[PDB]
Amino acid sequence: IIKTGDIMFAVLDTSVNSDEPGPILATIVTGKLKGSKLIGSFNLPSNADKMVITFNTMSIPGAEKTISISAYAIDPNTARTALASRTNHHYLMRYGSLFASSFLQGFGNAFQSANTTNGVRRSTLENAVIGLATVGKAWSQQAQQLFNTPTTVEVYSGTGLGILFTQDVT
Amino acid sequence: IIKTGDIMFAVLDTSVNSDEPGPILATIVTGKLKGSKLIGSFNLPSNADKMVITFNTMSIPGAEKTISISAYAIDPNTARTALASRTNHHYLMRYGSLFASSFLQGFGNAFQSANTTNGVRRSTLENAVIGLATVGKAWSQQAQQLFNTPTTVEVYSGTGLGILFTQDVT
Amino acid sequence: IIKTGDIMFAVLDTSVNSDEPGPILATIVTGKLKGSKLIGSFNLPSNADKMVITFNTMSIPGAEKTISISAYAIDPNTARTALASRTNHHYLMRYGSLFASSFLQGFGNAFQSANTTNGVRRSTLENAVIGLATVGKAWSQQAQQLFNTPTTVEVYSGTGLGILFTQDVT
Amino acid sequence: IIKTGDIMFAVLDTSVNSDEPGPILATIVTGKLKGSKLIGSFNLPSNADKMVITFNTMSIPGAEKTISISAYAIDPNTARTALASRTNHHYLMRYGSLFASSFLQGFGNAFQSANTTNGVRRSTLENAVIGLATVGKAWSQQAQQLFNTPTTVEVYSGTGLGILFTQDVT
Known part of the structure; x- marks a missing residue:
C-alpha cells in the first residue's frame, strides 16, 4: 500500500x-518497497530549464505483475x-551563428x-570583405532556423530522486 | 470534519x-489533523507577481483513502x-536584448x-560600428520574442502556509 | 519470464x-536467456545526435515461436x-557548399x-572572377537543398548495449 | 524451419x-539449405549511398513449391x-554541366x-565569348533538371551477403 504524497x-x-x-527507469532504495523498478517518461515544459519526470509503472520485487501508478520525481536538495x-542553451550555435x-x-x-x-578597389577589398557579404547573407538564411533549437536538459544516471505519488496505489 | 473558512x-x-x-505537496503541521498531506496545483494570473496555490486532495494519516477537497494557500504574513x-521579471533577458x-x-x-x-572610411568605421547594424538587426528580430517570457514566481520548500477551505469536509 | 525494468x-x-x-538484430550474451535474438528498429528524433533502438521481437533458443516484446536499447557507460x-553532421557538404x-x-x-x-576590363578580370558570379548563383541555388541533409547516426556491429523491457514478457 | 534472426x-x-x-536472385551456399533460390527486390532510401535488399520468396531444393518469406540482405565486413x-553520384554530369x-x-x-x-569590339570578342553567353544560358536551363539525377547504386553478381530472416519459416 502507498498513500498519496508518500x-x-x-x-x-x-x-x-x-x-x-x-x-x-528508477530504482527505489529506501523503504518497505526496496528495489522496485519505476518506469516513466519526461516532459520539457517548453519554457523551463528543468524537465518534469513522471513515473507511470512500478514493478515491485516479488509481485505477480506491474501496477499502474501516478507519480512524479522531485529533486532532493x-x-x-x-x-x-x-541544462544547455546553444549559445554558440544560435548566437554564434546569428x-x-x-x-x-x-x-x-x-x-x-x-x-x-562603383570605384576602383584592390583585390582583397572585394575578396575577404565584399565577397563575404553574400556568405553572411545565405548563412543568415540558415541561421534563423538554427535559433529555434530548444535548450537540452540532461539528468544523469546517478541522481537521487524523491518519488511523490499523487494517487493511491493498490 | 472541516468547516468552510477553517x-x-x-x-x-x-x-x-x-x-x-x-x-x-504541503504537510499540515498544527491542529487536530497533524501530518496530513495536501496535493494541489498553482496558477499564475498572467498579470500578477504572485501565484495562487489551490489544494484539491487531502490524505489524512489513518484514513482509509484520500478525500477530495477545496482549499487555497494563503501567505501567513x-x-x-x-x-x-x-518573483523574477527577466529585466536582463528582455531589456538587455531590446x-x-x-x-x-x-x-x-x-x-x-x-x-x-560615401567617401573613404577606415576599416574599423565599418568593422566595429557599421557592420554591427546588421547583427543588431537580426538580434532585434530575435529579441521581440524574448520579451514575451513570463515572470517566474518561485515558492520555496520551507514556506509555511495557511490553508483556507472553501468547502465542507466529510 | 521477464519483469518490467529488467x-x-x-x-x-x-x-x-x-x-x-x-x-x-542483437544477441543477448549474459543472463538466463542467452543467445536469444532481438529483432527491432530505430528512430532518429530529428533533433538529437543519437538514435533510439526499439526492439520489438525476441526469439528465445529452445522456444517454439518468436514472442512479441517491448524493449529499448540503452547505451552502457x-x-x-x-x-x-x-554521428555525422555534413559540415563540408552543407557549410562548405554554402x-x-x-x-x-x-x-x-x-x-x-x-x-x-566606361567599364574596360581584362580577360582574367572576367574569366575567374566575374564569370564565377553566375556559377555561384547557380551553385548556391542548389546548395540550399544540400543544407537539409539530415545528420547520420551509425551504431557499429560490436556495440554492446543493455536492453530495458518496458512491459512484462509472458 | 527457420527462426527469426537466423x-x-x-x-x-x-x-x-x-x-x-x-x-x-541469390543462392544460399552454407547451411542445411544449400542451394535455395531467394528472390527479392531492392529499395533506395533516397538519402543513402547504399540500397536495401529484401527477399520475399524462397525455393528450397526438393520442396513441393516456393514459400513466401521475409528476409533482408546484410553485407559482411x-x-x-x-x-x-x-556508388556513383554523377559529379561530372550534374556539377560539370552546372x-x-x-x-x-x-x-x-x-x-x-x-x-x-562605343562597342568597337572585335569579331572574336563576340565569336567565342559574348556569343557563348546565350548557349550557356540555354545549357544552364537544361542543367537544373539534369542536377536531379539520383545516385546509382550497383551490387555486383559475385557479392556474398548474409540473409537475416525477420519471420519464421513454416
Whole structure:
C-alpha cells in the first residue's frame, strides 16, 4: 500500500536527454518497497530549464505483475518537481551563428558601399570583405532556423530522486 | 470534519516554480489533523507577481483513502491568497536584448549615413560600428520574442502556509 | 519470464545507419536467456545526435515461436536510451557548399561592380572572377537543398548495449 | 524451419542497379539449405549511398513449391543491412554541366557589359565569348533538371551477403 504524497527515495539508472524521447527507469532504495523498478517518461515544459519526470509503472520485487501508478520525481536538495543535472542553451550555435553571419553581411555591405559614384578597389577589398557579404547573407538564411533549437536538459544516471505519488496505489 | 473558512497551517515541503507545471505537496503541521498531506496545483494570473496555490486532495494519516477537497494557500504574513518567495521579471533577458540589439542597429545605421554624396572610411568605421547594424538587426528580430517570457514566481520548500477551505469536509 | 525494468545485456551484431531504414538484430550474451535474438528498429528524433533502438521481437533458443516484446536499447557507460557510435553532421557538404557557392557570387558581383560608368576590363578580370558570379548563383541555388541533409547516426556491429523491457514478457 | 534472426550466408548471382527495377536472385551456399533460390527486390532510401535488399520468396531444393518469406540482405565486413559494390553520384554530369553551363553565361555577359556608352569590339570578342553567353544560358536551363539525377547504386553478381530472416519459416 502507498498513500498519496508518500515520498520514497529512488536513484536514477537511465540517464535522460530532452532531445531523445524514451522511457526512464528508477530504482527505489529506501523503504518497505526496496528495489522496485519505476518506469516513466519526461516532459520539457517548453519554457523551463528543468524537465518534469513522471513515473507511470512500478514493478515491485516479488509481485505477480506491474501496477499502474501516478507519480512524479522531485529533486532532493531543492524539493522541486523538476530535474536538470545539466541544462544547455546553444549559445554558440544560435548566437554564434546569428552574430557572425549577420556581421559578415553588414561588414561586406559596408565595404561595398564604402565608395560610390562603383570605384576602383584592390583585390582583397572585394575578396575577404565584399565577397563575404553574400556568405553572411545565405548563412543568415540558415541561421534563423538554427535559433529555434530548444535548450537540452540532461539528468544523469546517478541522481537521487524523491518519488511523490499523487494517487493511491493498490 | 472541516468547516468552510477553517484555517489550519501547513508547510510547503515541495518547492514550486511557475515555469514547470507540477503537483504541490504541503504537510499540515498544527491542529487536530497533524501530518496530513495536501496535493494541489498553482496558477499564475498572467498579470500578477504572485501565484495562487489551490489544494484539491487531502490524505489524512489513518484514513482509509484520500478525500477530495477545496482549499487555497494563503501567505501567513500578508494573509493574501498568493505565494511568492521570489518573483523574477527577466529585466536582463528582455531589456538587455531590446536595448542592446536596437542600440547596435541604430549605432550602425548612424555611422552608415555619416557622410553621403560615401567617401573613404577606415576599416574599423565599418568593422566595429557599421557592420554591427546588421547583427543588431537580426538580434532585434530575435529579441521581440524574448520579451514575451513570463515572470517566474518561485515558492520555496520551507514556506509555511495557511490553508483556507472553501468547502465542507466529510 | 521477464519483469518490467529488467536490463539484459546484448551485443549488436548488425550495424545500423540512420539513412537506410532496416531491421536491427542483437544477441543477448549474459543472463538466463542467452543467445536469444532481438529483432527491432530505430528512430532518429530529428533533433538529437543519437538514435533510439526499439526492439520489438525476441526469439528465445529452445522456444517454439518468436514472442512479441517491448524493449529499448540503452547505451552502457552512459545509461542513456540512445545509441550512437559515430554521428555525422555534413559540415563540408552543407557549410562548405554554402560558404563557397555564395562566396563566388559575392566575389564575382564585386568585380562586376568594381567599376561602372566606361567599364574596360581584362580577360582574367572576367574569366575567374566575374564569370564565377553566375556559377555561384547557380551553385548556391542548389546548395540550399544540400543544407537539409539530415545528420547520420551509425551504431557499429560490436556495440554492446543493455536492453530495458518496458512491459512484462509472458 | 527457420527462426527469426537466423543468418544464412548466400551469394548473389544477379547484378543489380538502382536505375533498373527488377528481381534479384541469390543462392544460399552454407547451411542445411544449400542451394535455395531467394528472390527479392531492392529499395533506395533516397538519402543513402547504399540500397536495401529484401527477399520475399524462397525455393528450397526438393520442396513441393516456393514459400513466401521475409528476409533482408546484410553485407559482411560491415554487417549493415544495405548492399553497395559501387556508388556513383554523377559529379561530372550534374556539377560539370552546372559549373560550365553557368560559367559560359557569366563569362559572356561580362564581355557584353565590358564596355557601355562605343562597342568597337572585335569579331572574336563576340565569336567565342559574348556569343557563348546565350548557349550557356540555354545549357544552364537544361542543367537544373539534369542536377536531379539520383545516385546509382550497383551490387555486383559475385557479392556474398548474409540473409537475416525477420519471420519464421513454416
